[PDB]
Amino acid sequence: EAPAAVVTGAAKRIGRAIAVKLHQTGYRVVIHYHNSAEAAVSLADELNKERSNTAVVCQADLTNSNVLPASCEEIINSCFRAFGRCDVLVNNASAFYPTPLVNGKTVETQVAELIGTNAIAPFLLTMSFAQRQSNLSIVNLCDAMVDQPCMAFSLYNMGKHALVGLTQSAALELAPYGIRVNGVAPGVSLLPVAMGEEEKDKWRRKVPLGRREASAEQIADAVIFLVSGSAQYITGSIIKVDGGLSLVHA
Amino acid sequence: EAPAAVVTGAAKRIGRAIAVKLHQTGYRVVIHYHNSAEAAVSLADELNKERSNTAVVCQADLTNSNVLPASCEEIINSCFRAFGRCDVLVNNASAFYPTPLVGKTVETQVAELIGTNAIAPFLLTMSFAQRQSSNLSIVNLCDAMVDQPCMAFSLYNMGKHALVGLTQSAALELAPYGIRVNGVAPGVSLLPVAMGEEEKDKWRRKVPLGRREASAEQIADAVIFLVSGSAQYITGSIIKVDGGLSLVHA
């Protein structure tokens, strides 16, 4: 019987690649999404055409609010409902935009989105994952540049730092239950086609290893390693997949 | 004219020692507090008896909420109202209790622990900066054990990690305004007055340097250094004041 995985923010880009790779590895998957309904449903349809009854979608807003714990429990619940088990949680969903210290979004909203998606939802999901329980593990999508942050991204950066601490705290606390908790920390990865070519080049030429971005598949490869039988003594580790970017001085 | 400082959670213990030392160095102080109203008022009284109208109190819950931004803005405003300037912000107030992964609701624990330890500091930092011989700085009370966290303290530890991220982000972003942003990271300092001495001795015995906890004053001494003219090129630094505790293996 096939294990099952929840991948948050899995309708497109890096989360989608992670879902695809877990599916190719033999996992059944819950494709969580927020706004990307068509892409999510299309992805589930493709995966089920490949192997029947192996993919479902699950919609949720992961912005912080008083109902977020119930939304996070329901995501985990949805994996048990479809597949009867939940072996892997990948916390990939993430809001990302600048919040200068000095658009129509209120600061209350920025806090809720940036800290909710990057940190609090990962925490609540982790809680519900553990509570609802083989090679069980969680993989948090972190950020290789967390200690050399981009200008004006304080709330996003706080979120991702929080996620490091969660990865560590949950690894320690969940180890007695046989649940491993690790991270993958991308540097520059899968720049959107629509992003300006000059801006894409500016970022790509920062990367010592090949002067290029990571593919989504390269990021997925590190997730696949961490959930695998070859990582069974690894917990609390965060693997940078950054081409050396984080090592480069100003 | 004398400089002014805001100290959050300044009624008792470490926040009080910081307030007192800043006042002894010649600062006017805002004594922020939440529940410890008697202690906050009598402290301000003691300081004002020493030098007339050099201390004021300002009450506010720093739990995350829709009204938290306005609260933080009003704390910085009270400094300007009292003293016409705000040179130093010390983010010391902090909720601290366990939140195991397996009567407060979790969404309330999220609000209190992430609010006090991270989101209020961010909002105070915004309000501080927006209001801007000059020697402006922020000191954030961090935690030397943030990478070796206590069992069952996920939310607290996430909060403190987010606080390291804020320290670094804001140091980078506010540097052009001449505002320095640093941290002080205690390990074991004052233990609860209610905690039995024999239990206190179990924390104390872990500390390499003298097998005892830090005084409030020892913590305050690092804060005084960082706000001083002797630290004018120091920004984004977090100084452990931990007696070596963070270096001690399991």
Place this chain on the structure above:
Amino acid sequence: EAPAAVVTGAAKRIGRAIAVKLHQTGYRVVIHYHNSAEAAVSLADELNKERSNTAVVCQADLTNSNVLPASCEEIINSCFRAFGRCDVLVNNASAFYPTPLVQGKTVETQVAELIGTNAIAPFLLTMSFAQRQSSNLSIVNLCDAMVDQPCMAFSLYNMGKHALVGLTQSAALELAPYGIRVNGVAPGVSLLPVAMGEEEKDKWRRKVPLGRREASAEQIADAVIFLVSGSAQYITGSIIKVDGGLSLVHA
């Protein structure tokens, strides 16, 4: 044809597991050793019995000295002589013993051995490896998860391991233009020997959150195999703990 790897200190324990797993993966291997000659030769015999002409031995002391650069050059050269290429270098050899700061090897001999094996030799091997340079070239350095919470009285060992973190990052940056990746694997507690008592072993095992046991040599080797593989082609400068959570545990 098959890629080739050098593994230092490969006769026993973790080094041997790394060599075996690389060989299983399709690599030809140079088994470097210092004193463990019988085990090195026995290992080469076993691997060659699986596939002919895929394992050789190279003896060298990796203590720091005036002759270490040449020794390191010869270790790399042993791989080219045998196999005609050198794709992977694994810096695993390591001296390990206490060097109390406050008081019969002389201190200069302890410096030589501990800094030599853990840091200078890996630097010199890295130089010789790079100088000899589609392909998938990489270096994996065996680091230590407890490098920031070091054991009492192990200053020189700990200095050597910190210096190795430095080399890992410095070499990642500098060799990236050549497509040579440089990474680390950081064990916590692994394969405790008979030379240790039950109290002492239980003391260490019991600290580990994930199962209250040491890592097997194979588990350390698994992380090495990943870093060397095509699945880690964008990874350089990364150090992967394989420590069961040990490093996260406060005092």
Place this chain on the structure above:
Amino acid sequence: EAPAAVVTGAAKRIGRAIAVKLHQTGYRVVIHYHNSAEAAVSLADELNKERSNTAVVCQADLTNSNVLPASCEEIINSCFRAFGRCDVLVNNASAFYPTPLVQGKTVETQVAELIGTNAIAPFLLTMSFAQRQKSSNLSIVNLCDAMVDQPCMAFSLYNMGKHALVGLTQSAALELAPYGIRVNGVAPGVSLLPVAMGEEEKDKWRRKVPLGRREASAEQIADAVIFLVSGSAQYITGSIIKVDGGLSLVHA
């Protein structure tokens, strides 16, 4: 009676600033030097002019070798010979130059100088400082580097040496705590550019620094040393204070 300090590499630049501040704060000082004998004796003269019999020079090569442990012991012994005590050690001496991995000095020499000055000598100085101990505020301050995790291209040996020094700072803080000896570091970013250096190269470095687009002064580095040795840092051990104007926070 005044406490005494050893400052390695103290004839000029940052080491001098440290020795001076220590002296002014009331320390008697051993000014260690390797090649800058004229600069060392001249500083000892100024300081002795301020207060008689409160400074001496001490020459030593801190390159790794089999006699380095004796050289380090003699530096400490020299503080006790002159002053009867040794309360503070500042490990500041440092060789600094590139050592490319892919192709002057032999590599054996590069290793000896860069690992010797930046790491092994500090270890041996620390051992001798501790061993020789017989109110008190004993400490050691190691001059580290804020950019140790974002190394400059082709500086692998120098970087290894500074990383080792981090490890020593931590290890020795742990092991010497029971003797009341605190061990800390100061990690400069960009500090005191040689007048030698070209206008354009100085500018490239200055422009990197978020806090005022300027390098640190020697005095600014020395201020952080003085803090760590002071009674205001009595519970601090094993800490490394960056003094870098935010340089280490700036991404590529």
